[PDB]
Coordinates of C-alpha atoms in Angstrom, one line a residue:
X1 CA 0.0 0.0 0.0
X2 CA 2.5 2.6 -1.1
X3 CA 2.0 6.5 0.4
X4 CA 0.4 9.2 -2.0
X5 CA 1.1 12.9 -1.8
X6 CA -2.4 14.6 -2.5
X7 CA -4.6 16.7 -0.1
X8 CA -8.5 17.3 -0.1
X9 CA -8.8 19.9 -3.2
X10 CA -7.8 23.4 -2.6
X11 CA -6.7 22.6 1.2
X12 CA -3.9 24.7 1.2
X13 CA -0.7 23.1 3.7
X14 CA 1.0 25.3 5.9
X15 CA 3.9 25.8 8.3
X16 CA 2.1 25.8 11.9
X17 CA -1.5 25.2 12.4
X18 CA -3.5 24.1 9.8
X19 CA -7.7 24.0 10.5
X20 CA -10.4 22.9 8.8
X21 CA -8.9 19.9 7.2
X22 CA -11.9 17.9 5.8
X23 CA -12.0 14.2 6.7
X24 CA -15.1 11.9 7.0
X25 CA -17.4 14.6 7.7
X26 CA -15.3 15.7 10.0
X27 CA -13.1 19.1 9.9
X28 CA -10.0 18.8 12.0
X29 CA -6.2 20.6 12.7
X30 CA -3.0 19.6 13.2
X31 CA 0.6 21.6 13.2
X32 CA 3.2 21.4 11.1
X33 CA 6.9 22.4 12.2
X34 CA 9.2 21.5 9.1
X35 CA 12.4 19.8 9.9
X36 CA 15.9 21.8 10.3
X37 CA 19.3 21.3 8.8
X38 CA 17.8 18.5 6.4
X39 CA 18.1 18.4 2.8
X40 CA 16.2 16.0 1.0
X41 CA 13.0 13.9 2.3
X42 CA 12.7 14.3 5.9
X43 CA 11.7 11.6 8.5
X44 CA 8.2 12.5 10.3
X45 CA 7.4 12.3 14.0
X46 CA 3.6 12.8 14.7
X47 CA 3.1 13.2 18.5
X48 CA -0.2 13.0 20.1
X49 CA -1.2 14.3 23.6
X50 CA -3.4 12.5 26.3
X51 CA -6.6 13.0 28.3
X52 CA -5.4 16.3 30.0
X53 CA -2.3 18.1 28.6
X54 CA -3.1 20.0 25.5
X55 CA -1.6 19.6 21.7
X56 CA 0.4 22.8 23.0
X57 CA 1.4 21.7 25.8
X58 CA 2.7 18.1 24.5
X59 CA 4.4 20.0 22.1
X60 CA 5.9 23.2 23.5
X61 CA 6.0 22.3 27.2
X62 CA 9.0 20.7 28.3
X63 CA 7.6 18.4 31.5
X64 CA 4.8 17.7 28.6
X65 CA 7.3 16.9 25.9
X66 CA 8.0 19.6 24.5
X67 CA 7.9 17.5 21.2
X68 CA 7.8 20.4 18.8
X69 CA 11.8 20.6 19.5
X70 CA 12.4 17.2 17.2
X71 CA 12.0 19.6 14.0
X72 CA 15.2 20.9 15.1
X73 CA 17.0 17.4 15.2
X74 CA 15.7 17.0 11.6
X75 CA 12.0 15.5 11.8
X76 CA 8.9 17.2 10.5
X77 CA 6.7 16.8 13.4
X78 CA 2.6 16.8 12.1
X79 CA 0.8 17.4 15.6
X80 CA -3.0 16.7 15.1
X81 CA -5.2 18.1 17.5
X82 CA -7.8 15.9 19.4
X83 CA -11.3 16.0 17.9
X84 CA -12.8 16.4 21.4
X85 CA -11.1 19.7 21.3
X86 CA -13.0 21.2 18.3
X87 CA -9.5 22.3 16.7
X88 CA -8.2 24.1 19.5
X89 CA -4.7 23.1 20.4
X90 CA -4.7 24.7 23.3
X91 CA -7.5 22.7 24.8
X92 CA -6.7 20.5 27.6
X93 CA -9.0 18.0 29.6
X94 CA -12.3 20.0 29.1
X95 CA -14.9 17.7 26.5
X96 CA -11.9 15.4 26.0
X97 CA -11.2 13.6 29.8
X98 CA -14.0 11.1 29.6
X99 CA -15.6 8.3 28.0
X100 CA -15.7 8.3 24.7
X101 CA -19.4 8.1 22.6
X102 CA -20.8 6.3 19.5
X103 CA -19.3 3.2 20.4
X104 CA -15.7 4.4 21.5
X105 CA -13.9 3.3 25.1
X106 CA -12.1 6.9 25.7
X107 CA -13.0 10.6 24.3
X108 CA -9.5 12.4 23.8
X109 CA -9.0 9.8 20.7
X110 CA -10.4 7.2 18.4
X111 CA -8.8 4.5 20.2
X112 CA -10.5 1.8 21.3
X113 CA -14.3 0.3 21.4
X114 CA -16.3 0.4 23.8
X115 CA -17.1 -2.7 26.4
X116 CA -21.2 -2.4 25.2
X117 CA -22.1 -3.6 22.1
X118 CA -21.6 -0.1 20.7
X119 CA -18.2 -0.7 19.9
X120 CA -19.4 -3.4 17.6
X121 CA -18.6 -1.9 14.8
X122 CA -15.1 -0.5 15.5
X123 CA -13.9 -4.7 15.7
X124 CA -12.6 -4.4 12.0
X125 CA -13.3 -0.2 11.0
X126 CA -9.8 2.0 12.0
X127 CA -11.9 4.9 12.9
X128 CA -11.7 8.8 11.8
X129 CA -8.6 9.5 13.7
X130 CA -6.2 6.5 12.1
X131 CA -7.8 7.2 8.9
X132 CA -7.4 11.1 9.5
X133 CA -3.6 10.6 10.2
X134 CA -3.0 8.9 7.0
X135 CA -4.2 11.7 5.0
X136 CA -3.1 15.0 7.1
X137 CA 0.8 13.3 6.4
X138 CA -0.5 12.5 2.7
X139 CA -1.7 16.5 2.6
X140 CA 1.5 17.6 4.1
X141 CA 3.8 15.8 1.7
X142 CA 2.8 17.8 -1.0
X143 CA 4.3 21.1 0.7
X144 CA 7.0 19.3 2.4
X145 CA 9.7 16.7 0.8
X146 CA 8.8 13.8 3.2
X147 CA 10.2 10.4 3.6
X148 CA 7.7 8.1 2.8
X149 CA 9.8 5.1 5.0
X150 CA 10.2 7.2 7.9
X151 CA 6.7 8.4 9.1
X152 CA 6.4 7.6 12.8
X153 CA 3.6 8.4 15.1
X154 CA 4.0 8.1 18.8
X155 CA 2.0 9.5 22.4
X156 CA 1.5 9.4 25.9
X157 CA -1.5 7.6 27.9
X158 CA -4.6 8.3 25.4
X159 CA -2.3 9.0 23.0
X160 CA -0.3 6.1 23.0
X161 CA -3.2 3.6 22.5
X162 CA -3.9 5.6 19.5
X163 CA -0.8 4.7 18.6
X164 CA -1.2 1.0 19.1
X165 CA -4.4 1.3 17.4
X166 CA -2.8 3.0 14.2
X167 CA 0.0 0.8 14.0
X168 CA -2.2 -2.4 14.1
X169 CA -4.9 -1.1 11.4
X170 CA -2.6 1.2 9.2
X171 CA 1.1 -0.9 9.2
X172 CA 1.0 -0.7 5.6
X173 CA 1.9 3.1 5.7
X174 CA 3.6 4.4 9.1
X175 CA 6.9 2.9 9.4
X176 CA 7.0 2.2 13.2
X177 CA 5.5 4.2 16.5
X178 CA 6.0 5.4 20.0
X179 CA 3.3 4.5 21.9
X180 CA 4.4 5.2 26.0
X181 CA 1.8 4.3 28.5
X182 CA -0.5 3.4 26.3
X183 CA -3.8 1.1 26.7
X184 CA -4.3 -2.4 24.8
X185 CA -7.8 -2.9 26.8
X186 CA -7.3 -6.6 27.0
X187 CA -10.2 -8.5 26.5
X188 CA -10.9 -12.7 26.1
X189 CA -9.7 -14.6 22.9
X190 CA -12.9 -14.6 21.7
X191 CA -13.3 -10.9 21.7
X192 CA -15.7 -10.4 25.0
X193 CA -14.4 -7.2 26.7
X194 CA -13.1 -7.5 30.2
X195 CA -13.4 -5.6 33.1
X196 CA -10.3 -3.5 34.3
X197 CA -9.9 -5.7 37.2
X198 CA -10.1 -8.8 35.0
X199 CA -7.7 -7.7 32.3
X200 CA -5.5 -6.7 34.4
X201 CA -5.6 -10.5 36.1
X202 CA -5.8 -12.0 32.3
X203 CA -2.1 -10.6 31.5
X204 CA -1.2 -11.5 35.3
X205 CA -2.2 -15.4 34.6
X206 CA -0.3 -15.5 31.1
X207 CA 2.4 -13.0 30.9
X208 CA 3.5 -14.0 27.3
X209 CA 0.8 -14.9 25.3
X210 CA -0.5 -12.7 22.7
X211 CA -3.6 -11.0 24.3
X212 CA -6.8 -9.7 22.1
X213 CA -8.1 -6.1 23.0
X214 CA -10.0 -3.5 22.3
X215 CA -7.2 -0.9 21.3
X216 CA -7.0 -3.0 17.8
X217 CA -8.9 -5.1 15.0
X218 CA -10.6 -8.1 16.8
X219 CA -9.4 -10.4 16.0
X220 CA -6.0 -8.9 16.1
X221 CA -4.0 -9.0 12.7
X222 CA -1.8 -13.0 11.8
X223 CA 0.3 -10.8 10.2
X224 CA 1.1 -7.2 10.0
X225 CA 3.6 -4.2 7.3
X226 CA 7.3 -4.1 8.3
X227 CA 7.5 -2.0 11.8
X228 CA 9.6 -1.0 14.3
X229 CA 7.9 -0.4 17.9
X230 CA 9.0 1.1 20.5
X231 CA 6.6 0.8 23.9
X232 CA 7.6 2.1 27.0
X233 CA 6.6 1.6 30.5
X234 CA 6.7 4.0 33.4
X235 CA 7.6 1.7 36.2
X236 CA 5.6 1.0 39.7
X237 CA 3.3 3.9 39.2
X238 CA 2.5 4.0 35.9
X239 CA -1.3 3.7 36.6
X240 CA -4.3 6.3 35.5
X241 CA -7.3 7.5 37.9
X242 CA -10.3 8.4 36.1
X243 CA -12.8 11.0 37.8
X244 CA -15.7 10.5 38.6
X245 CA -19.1 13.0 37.8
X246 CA -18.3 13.4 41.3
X247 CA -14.7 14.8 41.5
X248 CA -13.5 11.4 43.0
X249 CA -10.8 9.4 42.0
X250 CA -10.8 5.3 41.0
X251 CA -7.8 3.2 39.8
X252 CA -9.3 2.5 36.0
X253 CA -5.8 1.8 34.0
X254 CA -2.5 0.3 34.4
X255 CA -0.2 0.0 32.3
X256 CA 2.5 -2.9 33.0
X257 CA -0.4 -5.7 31.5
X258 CA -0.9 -3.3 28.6
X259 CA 2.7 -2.4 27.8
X260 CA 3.3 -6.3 27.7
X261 CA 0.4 -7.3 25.7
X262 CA 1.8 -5.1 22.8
X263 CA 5.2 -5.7 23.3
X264 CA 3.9 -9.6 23.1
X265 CA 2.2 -9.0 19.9
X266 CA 4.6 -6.9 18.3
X267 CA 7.6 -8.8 19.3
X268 CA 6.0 -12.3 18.0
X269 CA 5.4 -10.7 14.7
X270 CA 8.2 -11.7 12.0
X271 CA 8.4 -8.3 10.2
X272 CA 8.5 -6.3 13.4
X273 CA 11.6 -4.8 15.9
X274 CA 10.0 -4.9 18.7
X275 CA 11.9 -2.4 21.6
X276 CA 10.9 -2.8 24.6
X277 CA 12.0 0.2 27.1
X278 CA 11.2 0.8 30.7
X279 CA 11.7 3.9 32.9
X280 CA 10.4 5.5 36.3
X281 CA 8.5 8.3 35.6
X282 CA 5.2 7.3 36.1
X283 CA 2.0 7.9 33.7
X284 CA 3.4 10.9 31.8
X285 CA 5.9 11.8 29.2
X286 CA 9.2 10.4 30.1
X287 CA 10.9 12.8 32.6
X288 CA 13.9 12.3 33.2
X289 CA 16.7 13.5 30.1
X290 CA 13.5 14.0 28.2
X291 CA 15.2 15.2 25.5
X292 CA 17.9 12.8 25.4
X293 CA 15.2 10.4 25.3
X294 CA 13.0 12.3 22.1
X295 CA 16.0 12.1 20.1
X296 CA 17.4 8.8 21.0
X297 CA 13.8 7.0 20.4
X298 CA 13.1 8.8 17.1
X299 CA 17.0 8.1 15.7
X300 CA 15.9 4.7 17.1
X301 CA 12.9 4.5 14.9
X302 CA 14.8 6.2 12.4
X303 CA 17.6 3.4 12.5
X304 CA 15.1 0.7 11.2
X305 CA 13.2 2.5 7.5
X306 CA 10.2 0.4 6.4
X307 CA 11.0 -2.6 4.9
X308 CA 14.3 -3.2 6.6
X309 CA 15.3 -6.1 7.9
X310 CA 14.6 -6.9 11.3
X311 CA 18.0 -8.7 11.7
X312 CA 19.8 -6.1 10.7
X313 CA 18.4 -3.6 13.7
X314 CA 21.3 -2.3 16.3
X315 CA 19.6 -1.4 19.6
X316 CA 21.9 1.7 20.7
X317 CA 22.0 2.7 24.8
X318 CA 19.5 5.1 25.9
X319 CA 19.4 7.8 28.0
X320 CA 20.4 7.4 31.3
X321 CA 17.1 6.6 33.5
X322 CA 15.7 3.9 30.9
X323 CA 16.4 0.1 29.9
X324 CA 15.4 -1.0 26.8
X325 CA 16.0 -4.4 24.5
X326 CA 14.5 -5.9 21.6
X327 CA 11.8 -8.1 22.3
X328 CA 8.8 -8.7 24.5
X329 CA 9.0 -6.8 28.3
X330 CA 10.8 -9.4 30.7
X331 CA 11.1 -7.3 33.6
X332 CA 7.4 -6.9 34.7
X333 CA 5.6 -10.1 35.1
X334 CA 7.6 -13.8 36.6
X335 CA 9.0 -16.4 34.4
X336 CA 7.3 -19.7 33.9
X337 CA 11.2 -20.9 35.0
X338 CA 11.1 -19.2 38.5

């Protein structure tokens, strides 16, 4: 499925934020920061924000990511903007921190189905935001000099189960993702969706196997397009409390079972590099050398073009304050041999 340069007639790309971009009846934003010191087709990093921090903020705030600065280490980063937050980039949790409606699990993205029967339909349909990445990087392509084996997409918490969900319906076209902290919402083999309490014991019970979910097709993909995947864990804490109407707080993610249910399915699949990092942060953008970490997973990702062989990967050491290797997580759940 080879990537097209062409944008919705008479949408006119620019440097910065772009609004109104038509899309399945849709009309949505995104910002464009072209890449420094590059001649030639540029690799593209397309970050997406969570529940609560805005596109802004995950993109100019440093404790947020300040992911806006990888243009300047040679990536044209295409930021789309939540569609809970009606093209505002400055937005943050307000009409986007909630469940999700029309048969999706969680408002701030496209990401998942629902556990009712709602979500039906979104077992084998990507959804308007996978389908609306594909074509804001097709749109931008024609302004920019892109490289079509280097588009990347990568988030935190909400945003990183979009990212699992784009990379499992769309790995014909991005070359690999970031998804940290993201959600795989595990469910039984034959589809039925589980509980938070018993998903979370599902992984517990069997560690290693490949795990169904919600985040992706159902069932998931025998086989997906050449990928490399980075997923990252935040250690002990990396766990999410929903609010109530209320104002209380409940435990309603975590995201050790879910970071190694994809790094289980990505790692078993024969055209994938599956990286596996882990780090102490918590539920949030990577803190510590955050910086050191943008650039070392994106030249990571970088390191391994689509269609590359996955023997020919060399894991590099990151940052200081994360462990990473290729292959499923190891460090979170007991081996069957102990």
């Amino acid at each position: 499925e080879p990537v097209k340069w062409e944008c919705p007639a008479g949408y006119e790309v620019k440097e910065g934020l772009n609004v109104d971009f038509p899309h399945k009846g849709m009309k949505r934003a995104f910002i464009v920061y072209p890449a420094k010191n590059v001649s030639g087709p540029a690799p593209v990093w397309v970050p997406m924000t969570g529940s609560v921090e805005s596109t802004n903020d995950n993109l100019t705030v440093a404790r947020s990511g300040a992911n806006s600065i990888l243009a300047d280490h040679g990536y044209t980063v295409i930021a789309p903007v939540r569609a809970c937050a009606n093209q505002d980039p400055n937005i943050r949790g307000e009409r986007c921190n909630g469940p999700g409606s029309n048969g999706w699990n969680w408002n701030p993205w496209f990401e998942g189905r629902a556990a009712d029967p709602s979500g039906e339909h979104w077992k084998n349909d990507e959804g308007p935001d996978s389908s609306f990445f594909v074509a804001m990087v097709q749109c931008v392509g024609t302004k920019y000099k892109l490289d079509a084996r280097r588009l990347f997409l990568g988030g935190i918490c909400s945003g990183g189960t979009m990212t699992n969900r784009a990379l499992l319906f769309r790995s014909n076209f991005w070359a690999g993702g970031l998804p940290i902290s993201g959600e795989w919402y595990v469910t039984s083999d034959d589809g039925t969706p589980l509980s938070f309490d018993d998903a979370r014991a599902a992984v517990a019970a069997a560690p290693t196997k490949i795990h169904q979910g919600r985040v992706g097709p159902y069932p998931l993909p025998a086989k997906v397009g050449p990928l490399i995947v980075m997923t990252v864990w935040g250690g002990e804490k990396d766990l999410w409390n929903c609010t109530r109407p209320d104002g209380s707080r409940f435990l309603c993610a975590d995201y050790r079972p879910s970071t190694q249910a994809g790094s289980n399915f990505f790692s078993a699949q024969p055209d994938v590099v599956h990286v596996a990092c882990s780090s102490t942060h918590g539920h949030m953008w990577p803190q510590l050398n955050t910086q050191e970490f943008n650039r070392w997973a994106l030249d990571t990702l970088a390191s391994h073009p689509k269609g590359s062989d996955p023997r020919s990967f060399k894991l590099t050491q990151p940052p200081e304050g994360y462990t990473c290797h290729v292959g499923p997580f190891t460090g979170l759940y007991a081996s069957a041999w102990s």
